[PDB]
Amino acid sequence: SYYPVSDTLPPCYGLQHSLSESEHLLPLHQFMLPFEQLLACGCQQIAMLPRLLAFQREGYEVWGDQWPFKSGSVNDDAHQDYAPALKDLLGQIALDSDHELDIINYLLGYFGTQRAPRTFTTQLDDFRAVQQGYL
């Protein structure tokens, strides 16, 4: 569970205030957004650790792409115009799925065997589940 950094700031900055009552609220509340997603990646990846290090792996999915704010929160209401666009670039984590093949090479190394070398006739989607069930 992730609790936002925009909550702990003093209330005169207006982050928990009513939305867009004053005009200085919105450029501040977009400034805290990049430093929120860097901390929200750190809270996901500890919760992914039973998934990241299980021996019965089944997923493409690595470090994380979840939105930091709960859907009822006022912090969600500020960036509600571009929350569909920010979540979709957060789905760049499927492009980082080569890293998941480097953990299976590490988890197979407990039992003395390396992972298979990557070939040219892979069909890399169907290649990987063979490498997953091998572990």
């Binding site: 700031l9 003093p10 005169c12 400034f31």
Partner: protein, 127 residues
């Protein structure tokens, strides 16, 4: 509005934190940092800063108490030793506390301050 007073008090972020496309965040320079450093202190109340627990003017713990000469003399004492702890760059020189002529419930405090080390007037209003 010179570069000399910046060398005594430094540059910091303006308290309305408005960001611009040129020059980045609007910087409060030397004579105007110390005025805005007083505006931050009066505007926060103690306990709602994150780790600095006792930072901010507690005028909230004596309001809804009746206007007399004993409440007024407790404001001028509280507003004096609080600027001494949390504002080393601004020395207070007078406090005037009086209730407004229009609305009788509200009372208006007026803090007169000089900056330390320097006796340089501001030419006109700005930043």
């Amino acid at each position: 509005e010179n570069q000399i007073l910046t060398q005594l008090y430094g540059r910091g972020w303006a308290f309305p934190p408005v960001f611009s496309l040129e020059k980045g965040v609007e910087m409060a320079e030397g004579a105007e940092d110390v005025r805005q450093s007083l505006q931050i202190l009066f505007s926060t109340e103690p306990g709602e800063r994150l780790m600095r627990e006792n930072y901010g003017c507690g005028l909230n713990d004596f309001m809804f108490e009746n206007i007399r000469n004993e409440l007024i003399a407790e404001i001028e004492s509280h507003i004096h030793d609080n600027v001494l702890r949390y504002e080393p760059r601004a020395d207070m020189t007078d406090i005037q506390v009086r209730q407004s002529p229009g609305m009788g419930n509200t009372l208006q405090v007026q803090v007169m301050y000089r900056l330390r080390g320097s006796d340089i007037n501001q030419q006109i209003q700005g930043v």
